[PDB]
Nucleic acid binder design. Structure first.
Ligand SMILES: [Mg+2]
Ligand SMILES: [Zn+2]
Ligand SMILES: [Zn+2]
Ligand SMILES: [Zn+2]
Ligand SMILES: [Zn+2]
Ligand SMILES: [Zn+2]
Lengths: 505, 131
RNA sequence: GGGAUUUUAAUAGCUGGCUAUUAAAAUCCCG
C-alpha cells in the first residue's frame, strides 16, 4: 500500500528513473512522467536504452500461505520433530561495487557437515530486453574481521556446478536419516537470499523412481527425486528453514554458543558458523527443555538393539550380583523401579531424578554419596555421572560412535534418538578411573535338552564338554552382545571382577 | 545506497514466485485462493481513442480498455526472474499492454492467463474476431 | 554494504492529531 521495502531495490548508480514502458513499478518511474492522479504520461523524450541495472535480492519473506503448498519456515515443535534433517547453514557475503552499490552477494557458503563452497559474485541485472542472473563486480567486507575473505574473491566457482555439489553433499549426508532437509540458520535474511540461488519450492512431490518424498529437483530433466536418486540433480526441493535468533537469543552467535559449549572452537569460517548454529539449536531444544513428548519413528534396527540391551543386562547384572556375595543392590537411574533380574534373593533399592513410581526415591550423584552407597552394588545403566564410584556396574553410551540413531550434539555430547531424544554427555575416559573394562563372558543355569570357551560359566563347560543347546545359546548371546557393543555402549565394572567366583552356583 | 522500487505488500508473493518451480501456477493459485493481486503497476493516462490492440509501441486503448506499461504487467519482470520465452527476451517490456476495463483488478493475472491473437493481434476472447 | 528499533529534521498528504517518503543521529544484529 504505502510501506516500501528494500526488496528488488535499484542498486544502479544512475541518477534518474526508467521510462514508463520500461519501469517495473510506478515507484521506479522517473518523476518527470508522473501526474497528480498516480498516472504516468508518455512524453516525447526518448528513452535511455540500452541499460543494465543491478537489482537487490535482500528482503525475501516466505510467509505466504497457499493451499497445497507446505509451510517452510517451521516453528520450534515441528523442528524438534524434524531433528534428523538439521543442517546448519551460514553464508558470508561480498558487497556490490563499481557499477552498483546497495546489495550483497554470497561468497562462501558453509554447512554443518564441515563443507565450504566458494562462489563467484553473481547477481540479477535488469536490462531493456529483460533480466539476467550473471556475474557482477564485488568487494570484500572492509575491516580486519573479514581479512580472511579477501583471498576468497579469487577462488570462486560457477553457480551451476556449486548447485550440484551442494545437492550431492546433502544427498550423501541425509540419505539414511530423513526424507527432508531443514536449514538451521542464525540470521535468515541473507541466508534465504543465498538459498534463492540453489533452492526450489512448490507442492510436495513424489520421487520419480520410488515412493519416497522428493527432496531434489532437476531443471534439465524437470524431474523430482529423493536423496537416493538425486544423481546429477541441481536444485534442492522444498527445504525447511529455522531461525535460531527468533527463539529468544540476545547477542551474536559466538557469545551465545561459547556460553554452553567449548568443543567447536575454530577459525572464522562459514562452516564453523553453521556448526555453532546447529550446536546452539541442539542445546536450545534438547538440553534447555528436555522430556518434550515427541516419539521418533524407527529407521534400521532400534527394536533389535532394545531387545539385545536387555539380553546383555540380564546376564551382566545377574553375574555381578552372584559374584562377591553382594546382597544389597542400588539401581540408581531406574525410572519405574522394575528390577533387572529376580532370580537371586538380594535386597533391591531404586533411585531416579524423576521417579514415576512411589517405590523409587529422588537422587542426584555428585561423588559425595560415595561413602553413602558403600554397602552394596551400584547399577548405572544409561546413567550419566561425571565420576563413578568404585563398587558399581556401569553401561555408558560412547558419543564418539556416530550412527543413524546417534546425531552430533552439544559440548561433545550426542543426540541419541531411540523412540525418544536423549542428550548424552561426552564420553570421558577419566570417569571410569576407579573401574575396569568388563570382560566378555556368558553365564547360564538352564537345564539341558562345535564350541570351546574359556569364559563360559556352565556346569557343561565346567566338566570340559559342550552340547548343541549351549553351542546355540552362546552364539545368540554373541550376536546380541556384538550388536550392543557395535552400537556404542561400553560396559565397566568394579576392579576386582573375575568369573572364578561364579562356579559356586 | 540505491533507490527503492516495490511496496512491502507485494513482497510476500513475489518472493514465492522467486522460489517456485513454475511461477505462473504459483501466482494463479495465490490469487485464486484469496490472496491480494499485484499492485504498483504503471497505469498510463490516455485519450482512450486507440485501435485496441493487445501490445503496442504506444498507448492504443479504446474506451473499454486501460493502458499499462509492459514491464509492470509481466510477472517475470516484477519478480526479476528468468523469462520462459525464446532467447530470454520479454514480449511486454518496452511496450504498452491494453487490458479490458473489467479485468483491471489483476493485470498480471490477465497477462498470465491470456495470449494475443497471431493474426489480428487482439486479445483472444476480448476483441479478436477470426472465426 | 544490508536490516531492525528509537529520536530528530525536511517534504507530501489527511483529519489539536495522524500517516507515509527522504535525510541525519544513537543502539543492536548480519556481512
Ligand atoms: Mg557466519
Ligand atoms: Zn527415490
Ligand atoms: Zn558447540
Ligand atoms: Zn548341556
Ligand atoms: Zn517480462
Ligand atoms: Zn484474431
Amino acid at each position: 500500500s504505502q510501506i516500501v521495502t528494500g526488496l528488488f531495490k535499484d542498486c544502479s548508480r544512475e541518477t534518474s528513473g526508467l521510462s514508463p514502458a520500461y519501469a517495473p513499478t510506478y515507484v521506479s518511474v522517473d518523476d518527470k512522467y508522473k501526474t497528480s492522479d498516480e498516472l504516468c504520461v508518455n512524453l516525447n523524450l526518448p528513452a535511455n536504452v540500452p541499460y543494465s541495472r543491478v537489482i537487490s535480492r535482500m528482503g525475501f519473506k516466505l510467509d505466504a500461505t497457499v493451499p497445497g503448498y507446505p509451510k517452510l519456515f517451521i516453528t520450534r515443535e515441528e523442528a524438534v520433530r524434524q531433528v534428523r534433517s538439521w543442517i546448519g547453514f551460514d553464508v558470508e557475503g561480498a558487497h556490490a561495487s563499481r557499477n552498483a552499490c546497495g546489495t550483497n552477494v554470497p561468497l562462501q557458503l558453509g554447512f554443518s557437515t564441515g563443507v565450504n563452497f566458494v562462489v563467484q559474485p553473481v547477481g540479477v541485472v535488469d536490462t531493456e530486453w529483460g533480466n539476467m542472473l550473471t556475474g557482477i563486480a564485488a568487494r570484500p567486507p572492509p575491516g580486519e574481521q573479514f581479512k580472511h575473505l579477501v583471498p576468497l574473491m579469487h577462488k570462486g566457482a560457477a553457480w551451476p556446478i556449486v548447485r550440484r555439489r551442494i545437492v550431492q553433499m546433502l544427498s550423501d549426508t541425509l540419505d539414511k536419516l530423513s526424507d527432508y532437509c531443514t536449514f538451521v540458520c542464525w540470521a535468515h535474511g541473507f541466508a534465504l537470499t543465498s538459498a534463492s540461488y540453489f533452492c526450489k519450492i512448490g507442492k510436495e512431490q513424489k520421487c520419480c523412481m520410488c515412493n519416497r518424498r522428493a527432496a531434489a529437483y532437476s531443471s534439465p530433466l524437470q524431474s523430482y527425486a529423493c536423496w537416493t536418486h538425486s544423481c546429477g540433480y541441481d536444485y534442492v526441493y522444498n527445504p525447511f528453514f529455522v531461525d535460531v535468533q527468533q527463539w529468544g537469543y540476545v547477542g551474536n552467535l559466538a557469545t551465545n554458543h561459547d556460553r554452553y559449549c567449548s568443543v567447536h572452537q575454530g577459525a572464522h569460517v562459514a562452516s564453523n558458523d553453521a556448526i555453532m548454529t546447529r550446536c546452539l539449536a541442539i542445546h536450545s531444544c534438547f538440553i534447555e527443555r528436555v522430556d518434550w513428548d515427541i516419539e521418533y519413528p524407527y529407521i534400521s534396527h532400534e527394536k533389535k538393539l532394545n531387545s539385545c540391551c536387555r539380553i546383555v543386562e540380564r546376564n551382566v547384572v545377574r553375574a555381578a550380583l552372584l559374584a562377591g556375595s553382594f546382597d544389597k543392590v542400588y539401581d540408581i537411574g531406574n525410572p519405574k523401579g522394575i528390577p533387572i533380574v529376580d532370580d537371586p534373593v538380594v535386597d533391591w533399592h531404586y533411585f531416579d531424578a524423576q521417579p514415576l513410581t512411589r517405590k523409587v526415591q529422588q537422587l542426584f550423584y555428585t561423588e559425595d554419596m560415595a561413602s553413602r552407597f558403600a554397602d552394596g552394588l551400584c547399577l548405572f545403566w544409561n546413567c550419566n555421572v561425571p565420576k563413578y564410584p568404585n563398587n558399581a556396574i556401569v553401561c555408558r553410551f560412547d558419543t564418539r560412535v556416530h550412527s543413524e540413531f546417534n546425531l552430533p550434539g552439544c559440548d561433545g555430547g550426542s543426540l541419541y534418538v531411540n523412540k525418544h531424544a536423549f542428550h548424552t554427555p561426552a564420553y570421558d575416559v577419566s570417569a571410569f578411573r576407579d573401574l575396569k573394562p568388563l570382560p566378555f563372558f556368558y553365564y547360564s543355569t538352564t537345564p539341558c535338552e562345535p564350541l570351546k570357551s574359556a569364559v563360559c560359566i556352565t556346569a557343561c563347560n565346567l566338566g570340559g564338554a559342550v552340547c548343541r543347546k549351549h553351542a546355540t545359546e552362546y552364539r545368540e548371546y554373541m550376536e546380541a552382545y556384538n550388536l550392543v557393543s557395535a552400537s556404542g555402549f561400553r560396559l565397566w565394572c568394579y576392579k576386582t571382577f573375575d568369573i572364578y567366583n561364579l562356579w559356586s552356583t | 545506497a540505491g533507490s527503492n522500487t516495490e511496496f512491502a505488500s507485494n513482497s510476500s508473493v513475489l518472493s514465492l514466485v522467486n522460489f517456485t518451480v513454475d511461477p505462473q501456477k504459483a501466482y494463479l493459485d495465490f490469487v485464486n485462493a484469496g490472496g491480494a493481486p499485484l499492485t504498483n503497476c504503471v497505469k498510463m493516462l490516455t485519450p482512450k481513442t486507440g485501435t485496441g490492440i493487445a501490445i503496442s509501441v504506444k498507448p492504443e486503448s479504446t474506451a473499454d480498455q486501460e493502458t499499462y506499461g509492459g514491464a509492470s504487467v509481466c510477472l517475470y519482470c516484477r519478480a526479476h526472474i528468468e523469462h520462459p520465452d525464446v532467447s530470454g527476451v520479454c514480449k511486454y517490456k518496452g511496450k504498452f499492454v491494453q487490458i479490458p476495463a473489467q479485468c483491471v483488478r489483476d493485470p498480471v493475472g490477465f497477462c498470465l492467463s491470456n495470449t494475443p491473437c497471431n493474426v489480428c493481434q487482439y486479445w483472444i476472447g476480448y476483441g479478436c474476431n477470426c472465426d
